[PDB]
């Protein structure tokens, strides 16, 4: 039981979200990519466009989006464009600005809802981590759990 107590004191699951956020902000990219070649890194842009077209988004629009994302320089503008992908996704589905002239509301399937929720909360969690906001991180952990 004594070692069990010490394990319940440190097991990375009952620890604070402050600690988990600090870990995820601590580790770097170079320490995890270096040594490997430039081949195992799948083209993230291809996967992005693939998942988006899987979510029934306009191919022209998403292609232009991903091309601008590739071409642009600056971590700030890139994450801003990411949030733009997020809002245009959540507007193509769940059409807000459309006045919805008809009275019939046909919501989408639960799979599409889960896809939407996961992408949204993941993007926002990564952003909060980049900005370091513990109550928002706790709230998002609550949403997931």
């Amino acid at each position: 039981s004594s070692t069990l107590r010490e394990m319940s004191l440190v097991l990375f699951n009952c620890s604070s979200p402050k600690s988990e956020m600090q870990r995820a902000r601590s580790l770097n990219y170079q320490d995890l990519v270096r040594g490997f070649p430039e081949e195992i890194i799948s083209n993230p842009y291809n996967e992005m466009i693939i998942t988006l077209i899987d979510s029934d988004v306009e191919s022209f629009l998403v292609h232009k989006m991903v091309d601008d994302l590739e071409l642009q320089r600056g971590t700030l503008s890139k994450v801003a464009i990411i949030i733009a992908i997020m809002i245009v996704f959540s507007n193509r589905v769940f059409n807000v600005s459309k006045p919805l002239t008809d009275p019939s509301f046909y919501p989408p399937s639960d799979p599409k809802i889960l896809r939407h929720f996961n992408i949204c909360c993941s993007t926002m969690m990564y952003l909060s981590t980049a900005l370091g906001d513990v109550p928002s991180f706790a709230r998002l952990h609550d949403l997931y759990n």
Binding site: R25, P44, A84, I87, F94, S128, G132, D133
Partner: protein, 48 residues
């Protein structure tokens, strides 16, 4: 992450807001952020 190879980002939150607004005027041409706050619950956690 493979797109943005840097976590622990830093910069003005205002700049993010204005940049997102500009890119949105470019891409969608319809929506803004005041049509979003307290109506979609997307940016109800960050300060943007």
């Amino acid at each position: 992450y493979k797109i943005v190879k840097t976590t622990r980002l830093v910069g003005s939150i205002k700049d993010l807001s204005r940049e997102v607004e500009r890119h949105l005027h470019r891409y969608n041409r319809w929506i803004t952020l005041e049509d979003i706050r307290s109506r979609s619950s997307l940016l109800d956690y960050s300060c943007l």
